[PDB]
Amino acid sequence: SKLEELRRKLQEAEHKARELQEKWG
Amino acid sequence: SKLEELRRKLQEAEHKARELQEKWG
Amino acid sequence: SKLEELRRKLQEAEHKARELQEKWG
Amino acid sequence: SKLEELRRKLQEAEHKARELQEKWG
């Protein structure tokens, strides 16, 4: 469970990085 | 706040990693 | 370029977390 | 070691995100 939660938070962070790059890359 | 949201999610992931270390070392 | 480097670091961490979960599964 | 490596990658990504946030300030 905890590792699954870690991976979900990390995927959400990567999605925000993708969105940052869409706007500012 | 995209970058702020990214950092918040990343902190949450790191906290889950520390919770795993509390159990498994 | 620093936005790509940040995204790719998060992706590297995703790789490590997936591999850890594969060993746990 | 593998959990410590994962936690380290997350800390490295936070270091990059903080650096980005400081430049964007």
GROMACS .gro file of N, CA, C and O in nm:
model
  400
    1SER      N    1   0.080  -0.122   0.000
    1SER     CA    2   0.000   0.000   0.000
    1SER      C    3   0.084   0.127   0.000
    1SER      O    4   0.056   0.219  -0.077
    2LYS      N    5   0.185   0.134   0.087
    2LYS     CA    6   0.264   0.256   0.095
    2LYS      C    7   0.343   0.280  -0.032
    2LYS      O    8   0.353   0.393  -0.080
    3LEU      N    9   0.402   0.174  -0.088
    3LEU     CA   10   0.475   0.191  -0.213
    3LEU      C   11   0.381   0.229  -0.326
    3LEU      O   12   0.417   0.309  -0.413
    4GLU      N   13   0.259   0.173  -0.328
    4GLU     CA   14   0.162   0.215  -0.429
    4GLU      C   15   0.131   0.364  -0.415
    4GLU      O   16   0.127   0.437  -0.516
    5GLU      N   17   0.110   0.412  -0.292
    5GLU     CA   18   0.085   0.554  -0.269
    5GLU      C   19   0.204   0.640  -0.314
    5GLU      O   20   0.186   0.746  -0.376
    6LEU      N   21   0.326   0.595  -0.283
    6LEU     CA   22   0.445   0.666  -0.328
    6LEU      C   23   0.445   0.680  -0.480
    6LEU      O   24   0.466   0.790  -0.533
    7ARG      N   25   0.423   0.569  -0.550
    7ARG     CA   26   0.424   0.574  -0.697
    7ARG      C   27   0.315   0.664  -0.753
    7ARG      O   28   0.336   0.732  -0.855
    8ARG      N   29   0.197   0.668  -0.690
    8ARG     CA   30   0.090   0.757  -0.735
    8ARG      C   31   0.129   0.903  -0.717
    8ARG      O   32   0.109   0.986  -0.808
    9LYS      N   33   0.183   0.939  -0.600
    9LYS     CA   34   0.226   1.077  -0.578
    9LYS      C   35   0.333   1.115  -0.678
    9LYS      O   36   0.335   1.227  -0.729
   10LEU      N   37   0.425   1.024  -0.703
   10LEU     CA   38   0.535   1.053  -0.794
   10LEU      C   39   0.485   1.068  -0.937
   10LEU      O   40   0.531   1.155  -1.010
   11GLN      N   41   0.386   0.987  -0.976
   11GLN     CA   42   0.329   1.005  -1.110
   11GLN      C   43   0.257   1.139  -1.122
   11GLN      O   44   0.267   1.207  -1.226
   12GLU      N   45   0.186   1.180  -1.017
   12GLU     CA   46   0.121   1.310  -1.019
   12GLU      C   47   0.224   1.423  -1.030
   12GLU      O   48   0.202   1.520  -1.104
   13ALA      N   49   0.338   1.409  -0.962
   13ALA     CA   50   0.445   1.507  -0.977
   13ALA      C   51   0.499   1.510  -1.120
   13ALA      O   52   0.522   1.617  -1.175
   14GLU      N   53   0.520   1.393  -1.180
   14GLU     CA   54   0.570   1.389  -1.316
   14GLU      C   55   0.470   1.453  -1.412
   14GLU      O   56   0.510   1.524  -1.506
   15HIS      N   57   0.340   1.433  -1.388
   15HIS     CA   58   0.240   1.498  -1.472
   15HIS      C   59   0.249   1.650  -1.461
   15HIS      O   60   0.233   1.721  -1.561
   16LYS      N   61   0.271   1.702  -1.340
   16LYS     CA   62   0.289   1.846  -1.325
   16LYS      C   63   0.415   1.894  -1.396
   16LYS      O   64   0.417   2.002  -1.456
   17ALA      N   65   0.522   1.813  -1.393
   17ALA     CA   66   0.641   1.847  -1.470
   17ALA      C   67   0.613   1.850  -1.620
   17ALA      O   68   0.661   1.940  -1.692
   18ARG      N   69   0.533   1.755  -1.670
   18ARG     CA   70   0.493   1.757  -1.810
   18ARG      C   71   0.417   1.885  -1.843
   18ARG      O   72   0.441   1.948  -1.945
   19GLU      N   73   0.326   1.925  -1.755
   19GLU     CA   74   0.248   2.047  -1.777
   19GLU      C   75   0.336   2.173  -1.773
   19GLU      O   76   0.315   2.267  -1.851
   20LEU      N   77   0.430   2.179  -1.677
   20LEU     CA   78   0.527   2.289  -1.674
   20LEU      C   79   0.604   2.298  -1.804
   20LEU      O   80   0.624   2.407  -1.859
   21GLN      N   81   0.646   2.184  -1.857
   21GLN     CA   82   0.723   2.183  -1.981
   21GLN      C   83   0.637   2.222  -2.101
   21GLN      O   84   0.685   2.289  -2.193
   22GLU      N   85   0.511   2.181  -2.103
   22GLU     CA   86   0.422   2.223  -2.211
   22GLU      C   87   0.415   2.375  -2.219
   22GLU      O   88   0.419   2.434  -2.329
   23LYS      N   89   0.404   2.440  -2.104
   23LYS     CA   90   0.386   2.585  -2.101
   23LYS      C   91   0.517   2.660  -2.122
   23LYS      O   92   0.519   2.760  -2.194
   24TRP      N   93   0.627   2.613  -2.062
   24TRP     CA   94   0.750   2.692  -2.055
   24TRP      C   95   0.866   2.636  -2.135
   24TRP      O   96   0.968   2.705  -2.151
   25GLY      N   97   0.854   2.516  -2.190
   25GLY     CA   98   0.957   2.458  -2.274
   25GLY      C   99   0.952   2.517  -2.415
   25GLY      O  100   0.875   2.609  -2.442
   26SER      N  101   0.247   2.823  -0.925
   26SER     CA  102   0.189   2.715  -0.846
   26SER      C  103   0.184   2.579  -0.915
   26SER      O  104   0.154   2.481  -0.848
   27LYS      N  105   0.212   2.570  -1.046
   27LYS     CA  106   0.238   2.438  -1.101
   27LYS      C  107   0.361   2.378  -1.036
   27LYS      O  108   0.360   2.263  -0.991
   28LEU      N  109   0.468   2.457  -1.030
   28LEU     CA  110   0.591   2.409  -0.968
   28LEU      C  111   0.569   2.386  -0.819
   28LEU      O  112   0.624   2.290  -0.763
   29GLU      N  113   0.486   2.468  -0.755
   29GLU     CA  114   0.458   2.445  -0.613
   29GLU      C  115   0.381   2.314  -0.592
   29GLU      O  116   0.413   2.236  -0.501
   30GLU      N  117   0.282   2.287  -0.677
   30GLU     CA  118   0.210   2.159  -0.670
   30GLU      C  119   0.303   2.041  -0.696
   30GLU      O  120   0.295   1.938  -0.628
   31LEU      N  121   0.391   2.053  -0.796
   31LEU     CA  122   0.490   1.950  -0.821
   31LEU      C  123   0.571   1.921  -0.696
   31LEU      O  124   0.590   1.806  -0.657
   32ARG      N  125   0.621   2.027  -0.632
   32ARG     CA  126   0.704   2.004  -0.515
   32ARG      C  127   0.624   1.943  -0.401
   32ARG      O  128   0.679   1.862  -0.325
   33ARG      N  129   0.496   1.978  -0.389
   33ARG     CA  130   0.415   1.921  -0.281
   33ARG      C  131   0.397   1.771  -0.300
   33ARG      O  132   0.417   1.692  -0.206
   34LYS      N  133   0.364   1.729  -0.423
   34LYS     CA  134   0.349   1.588  -0.455
   34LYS      C  135   0.480   1.512  -0.433
   34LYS      O  136   0.480   1.401  -0.380
   35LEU      N  137   0.591   1.572  -0.472
   35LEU     CA  138   0.720   1.509  -0.454
   35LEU      C  139   0.754   1.492  -0.306
   35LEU      O  140   0.807   1.388  -0.266
   36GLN      N  141   0.723   1.593  -0.224
   36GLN     CA  142   0.742   1.582  -0.079
   36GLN      C  143   0.658   1.469  -0.022
   36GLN      O  144   0.705   1.390   0.061
   37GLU      N  145   0.533   1.458  -0.069
   37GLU     CA  146   0.447   1.349  -0.024
   37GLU      C  147   0.504   1.212  -0.062
   37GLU      O  148   0.497   1.117   0.017
   38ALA      N  149   0.564   1.201  -0.180
   38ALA     CA  150   0.628   1.076  -0.218
   38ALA      C  151   0.748   1.047  -0.130
   38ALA      O  152   0.769   0.934  -0.085
   39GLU      N  153   0.829   1.149  -0.102
   39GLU     CA  154   0.946   1.127  -0.018
   39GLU      C  155   0.905   1.085   0.123
   39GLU      O  156   0.971   1.001   0.185
   40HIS      N  157   0.795   1.141   0.174
   40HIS     CA  158   0.744   1.102   0.306
   40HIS      C  159   0.701   0.956   0.308
   40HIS      O  160   0.721   0.885   0.408
   41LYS      N  161   0.639   0.909   0.198
   41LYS     CA  162   0.605   0.767   0.190
   41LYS      C  163   0.731   0.681   0.187
   41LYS      O  164   0.734   0.572   0.246
   42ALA      N  165   0.837   0.728   0.122
   42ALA     CA  166   0.962   0.652   0.125
   42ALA      C  167   1.018   0.644   0.266
   42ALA      O  168   1.069   0.539   0.308
   43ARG      N  169   1.012   0.753   0.342
   43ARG     CA  170   1.057   0.748   0.480
   43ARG      C  171   0.969   0.658   0.566
   43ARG      O  172   1.020   0.591   0.656
   44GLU      N  173   0.838   0.651   0.538
   44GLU     CA  174   0.753   0.557   0.611
   44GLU      C  175   0.790   0.412   0.580
   44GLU      O  176   0.786   0.326   0.669
   45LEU      N  177   0.829   0.384   0.455
   45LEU     CA  178   0.875   0.249   0.424
   45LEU      C  179   1.004   0.216   0.498
   45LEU      O  180   1.021   0.104   0.546
   46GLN      N  181   1.094   0.315   0.511
   46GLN     CA  182   1.219   0.293   0.585
   46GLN      C  183   1.194   0.270   0.734
   46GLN      O  184   1.269   0.195   0.798
   47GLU      N  185   1.089   0.332   0.788
   47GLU     CA  186   1.053   0.308   0.928
   47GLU      C  187   1.023   0.161   0.954
   47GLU      O  188   1.050   0.110   1.064
   48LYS      N  189   0.968   0.092   0.854
   48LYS     CA  190   0.935  -0.050   0.866
   48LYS      C  191   1.050  -0.139   0.822
   48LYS      O  192   1.091  -0.229   0.897
   49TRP      N  193   1.109  -0.113   0.705
   49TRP     CA  194   1.202  -0.208   0.643
   49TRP      C  195   1.347  -0.168   0.657
   49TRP      O  196   1.436  -0.246   0.620
   50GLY      N  197   1.374  -0.050   0.711
   50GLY     CA  198   1.510  -0.003   0.729
   50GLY      C  199   1.556   0.083   0.613
   50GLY      O  200   1.494   0.085   0.506
   51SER      N  201   1.585   2.356  -2.109
   51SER     CA  202   1.656   2.231  -2.082
   51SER      C  203   1.647   2.186  -1.936
   51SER      O  204   1.642   2.065  -1.908
   52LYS      N  205   1.641   2.281  -1.841
   52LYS     CA  206   1.630   2.245  -1.700
   52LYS      C  207   1.493   2.185  -1.668
   52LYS      O  208   1.480   2.107  -1.573
   53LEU      N  209   1.391   2.221  -1.745
   53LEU     CA  210   1.259   2.160  -1.726
   53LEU      C  211   1.260   2.015  -1.772
   53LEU      O  212   1.201   1.928  -1.708
   54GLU      N  213   1.328   1.987  -1.883
   54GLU     CA  214   1.341   1.849  -1.927
   54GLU      C  215   1.422   1.768  -1.826
   54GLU      O  216   1.391   1.651  -1.799
   55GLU      N  217   1.528   1.828  -1.770
   55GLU     CA  218   1.611   1.756  -1.673
   55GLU      C  219   1.533   1.722  -1.547
   55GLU      O  220   1.549   1.612  -1.492
   56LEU      N  221   1.446   1.816  -1.501
   56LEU     CA  222   1.362   1.789  -1.384
   56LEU      C  223   1.263   1.677  -1.414
   56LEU      O  224   1.249   1.584  -1.335
   57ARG      N  225   1.193   1.686  -1.529
   57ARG     CA  226   1.100   1.580  -1.566
   57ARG      C  227   1.171   1.445  -1.575
   57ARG      O  228   1.122   1.345  -1.522
   58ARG      N  229   1.288   1.441  -1.638
   58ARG     CA  230   1.357   1.313  -1.653
   58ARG      C  231   1.404   1.256  -1.519
   58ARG      O  232   1.410   1.133  -1.503
   59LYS      N  233   1.438   1.342  -1.422
   59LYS     CA  234   1.471   1.292  -1.288
   59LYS      C  235   1.351   1.229  -1.221
   59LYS      O  236   1.364   1.126  -1.153
   60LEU      N  237   1.233   1.289  -1.239
   60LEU     CA  238   1.113   1.228  -1.182
   60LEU      C  239   1.084   1.095  -1.250
   60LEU      O  240   1.044   0.999  -1.184
   61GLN      N  241   1.108   1.089  -1.381
   61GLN     CA  242   1.089   0.964  -1.453
   61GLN      C  243   1.189   0.858  -1.407
   61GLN      O  244   1.153   0.740  -1.397
   62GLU      N  245   1.315   0.897  -1.380
   62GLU     CA  246   1.411   0.801  -1.324
   62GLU      C  247   1.362   0.745  -1.192
   62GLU      O  248   1.372   0.625  -1.166
   63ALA      N  249   1.309   0.832  -1.105
   63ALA     CA  250   1.256   0.786  -0.978
   63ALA      C  251   1.138   0.693  -0.997
   63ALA      O  252   1.123   0.595  -0.924
   64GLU      N  253   1.052   0.723  -1.095
   64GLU     CA  254   0.943   0.631  -1.126
   64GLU      C  255   0.997   0.493  -1.165
   64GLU      O  256   0.944   0.391  -1.120
   65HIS      N  257   1.103   0.490  -1.247
   65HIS     CA  258   1.166   0.362  -1.283
   65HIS      C  259   1.212   0.286  -1.158
   65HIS      O  260   1.187   0.166  -1.145
   66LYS      N  261   1.283   0.354  -1.068
   66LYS     CA  262   1.329   0.286  -0.948
   66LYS      C  263   1.212   0.235  -0.864
   66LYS      O  264   1.219   0.124  -0.809
   67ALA      N  265   1.105   0.314  -0.851
   67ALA     CA  266   0.993   0.271  -0.768
   67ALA      C  267   0.920   0.154  -0.831
   67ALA      O  268   0.872   0.064  -0.760
   68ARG      N  269   0.908   0.153  -0.963
   68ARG     CA  270   0.848   0.038  -1.030
   68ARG      C  271   0.932  -0.087  -1.008
   68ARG      O  272   0.878  -0.194  -0.979
   69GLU      N  273   1.064  -0.075  -1.020
   69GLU     CA  274   1.150  -0.191  -1.004
   69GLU      C  275   1.142  -0.247  -0.864
   69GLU      O  276   1.141  -0.369  -0.844
   70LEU      N  277   1.139  -0.158  -0.764
   70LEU     CA  278   1.123  -0.200  -0.626
   70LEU      C  279   0.993  -0.276  -0.606
   70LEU      O  280   0.989  -0.380  -0.540
   71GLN      N  281   0.884  -0.225  -0.663
   71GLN     CA  282   0.755  -0.291  -0.651
   71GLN      C  283   0.752  -0.426  -0.724
   71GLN      O  284   0.685  -0.520  -0.679
   72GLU      N  285   0.825  -0.438  -0.836
   72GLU     CA  286   0.837  -0.566  -0.904
   72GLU      C  287   0.903  -0.670  -0.815
   72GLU      O  288   0.862  -0.787  -0.813
   73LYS      N  289   1.007  -0.630  -0.741
   73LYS     CA  290   1.071  -0.722  -0.648
   73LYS      C  291   0.979  -0.755  -0.531
   73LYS      O  292   0.982  -0.867  -0.479
   74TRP      N  293   0.896  -0.659  -0.488
   74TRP     CA  294   0.802  -0.682  -0.379
   74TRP      C  295   0.683  -0.767  -0.421
   74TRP      O  296   0.618  -0.827  -0.335
   75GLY      N  297   0.653  -0.774  -0.551
   75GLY     CA  298   0.538  -0.848  -0.599
   75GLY      C  299   0.563  -0.996  -0.622
   75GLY      O  300   0.486  -1.064  -0.691
   76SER      N  301   1.939  -0.057   0.088
   76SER     CA  302   2.003   0.022  -0.018
   76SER      C  303   1.909   0.068  -0.129
   76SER      O  304   1.917   0.183  -0.174
   77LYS      N  305   1.821  -0.021  -0.174
   77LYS     CA  306   1.734   0.016  -0.286
   77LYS      C  307   1.631   0.120  -0.245
   77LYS      O  308   1.598   0.210  -0.324
   78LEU      N  309   1.576   0.107  -0.123
   78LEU     CA  310   1.485   0.209  -0.073
   78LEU      C  311   1.558   0.341  -0.047
   78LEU      O  312   1.505   0.449  -0.076
   79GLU      N  313   1.681   0.334   0.005
   79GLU     CA  314   1.760   0.456   0.023
   79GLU      C  315   1.790   0.523  -0.111
   79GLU      O  316   1.785   0.646  -0.122
   80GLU      N  317   1.820   0.443  -0.214
   80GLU     CA  318   1.842   0.499  -0.348
   80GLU      C  319   1.718   0.570  -0.399
   80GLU      O  320   1.727   0.679  -0.456
   81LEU      N  321   1.602   0.506  -0.385
   81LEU     CA  322   1.478   0.569  -0.428
   81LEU      C  323   1.455   0.700  -0.353
   81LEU      O  324   1.424   0.803  -0.413
   82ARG      N  325   1.471   0.697  -0.220
   82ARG     CA  326   1.452   0.820  -0.145
   82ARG      C  327   1.549   0.927  -0.192
   82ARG      O  328   1.512   1.045  -0.201
   83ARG      N  329   1.673   0.887  -0.225
   83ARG     CA  330   1.772   0.983  -0.274
   83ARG      C  331   1.731   1.045  -0.407
   83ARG      O  332   1.748   1.165  -0.427
   84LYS      N  333   1.677   0.963  -0.500
   84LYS     CA  334   1.633   1.018  -0.628
   84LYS      C  335   1.523   1.120  -0.608
   84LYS      O  336   1.515   1.221  -0.678
   85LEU      N  337   1.433   1.094  -0.513
   85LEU     CA  338   1.328   1.190  -0.482
   85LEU      C  339   1.387   1.318  -0.426
   85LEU      O  340   1.338   1.427  -0.456
   86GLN      N  341   1.491   1.306  -0.342
   86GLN     CA  342   1.555   1.425  -0.286
   86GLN      C  343   1.628   1.503  -0.394
   86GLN      O  344   1.626   1.628  -0.394
   87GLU      N  345   1.691   1.433  -0.489
   87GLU     CA  346   1.757   1.498  -0.602
   87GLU      C  347   1.657   1.575  -0.688
   87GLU      O  348   1.686   1.685  -0.736
   88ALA      N  349   1.539   1.518  -0.710
   88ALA     CA  350   1.437   1.589  -0.787
   88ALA      C  351   1.387   1.712  -0.713
   88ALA      O  352   1.359   1.815  -0.775
   89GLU      N  353   1.373   1.702  -0.581
   89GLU     CA  354   1.339   1.821  -0.504
   89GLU      C  355   1.448   1.927  -0.513
   89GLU      O  356   1.419   2.047  -0.521
   90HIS      N  357   1.575   1.885  -0.516
   90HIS     CA  358   1.681   1.986  -0.528
   90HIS      C  359   1.670   2.060  -0.661
   90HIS      O  360   1.685   2.182  -0.665
   91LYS      N  361   1.640   1.988  -0.769
   91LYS     CA  362   1.622   2.052  -0.899
   91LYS      C  363   1.499   2.142  -0.900
   91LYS      O  364   1.502   2.251  -0.958
   92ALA      N  365   1.390   2.099  -0.837
   92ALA     CA  366   1.268   2.179  -0.839
   92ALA      C  367   1.286   2.306  -0.757
   92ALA      O  368   1.236   2.412  -0.795
   93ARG      N  369   1.355   2.296  -0.643
   93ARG     CA  370   1.384   2.415  -0.563
   93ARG      C  371   1.474   2.512  -0.639
   93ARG      O  372   1.452   2.634  -0.635
   94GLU      N  373   1.577   2.460  -0.706
   94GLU     CA  374   1.664   2.545  -0.788
   94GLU      C  375   1.584   2.617  -0.895
   94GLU      O  376   1.602   2.738  -0.919
   95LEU      N  377   1.495   2.545  -0.963
   95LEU     CA  378   1.410   2.608  -1.063
   95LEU      C  379   1.325   2.717  -1.000
   95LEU      O  380   1.312   2.827  -1.055
   96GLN      N  381   1.265   2.688  -0.884
   96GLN     CA  382   1.179   2.786  -0.818
   96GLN      C  383   1.258   2.910  -0.779
   96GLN      O  384   1.207   3.022  -0.788
   97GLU      N  385   1.384   2.892  -0.737
   97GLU     CA  386   1.468   3.006  -0.700
   97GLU      C  387   1.502   3.092  -0.821
   97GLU      O  388   1.506   3.215  -0.812
   98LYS      N  389   1.530   3.028  -0.935
   98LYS     CA  390   1.557   3.104  -1.056
   98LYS      C  391   1.432   3.177  -1.103
   98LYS      O  392   1.440   3.292  -1.150
   99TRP      N  393   1.316   3.114  -1.088
   99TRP     CA  394   1.191   3.175  -1.130
   99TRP      C  395   1.139   3.280  -1.032
   99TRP      O  396   1.042   3.350  -1.064
  100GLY      N  397   1.201   3.294  -0.915
  100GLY     CA  398   1.159   3.396  -0.821
  100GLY      C  399   1.190   3.535  -0.872
  100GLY      O  400   1.279   3.552  -0.955
   0.00000   0.00000   0.00000
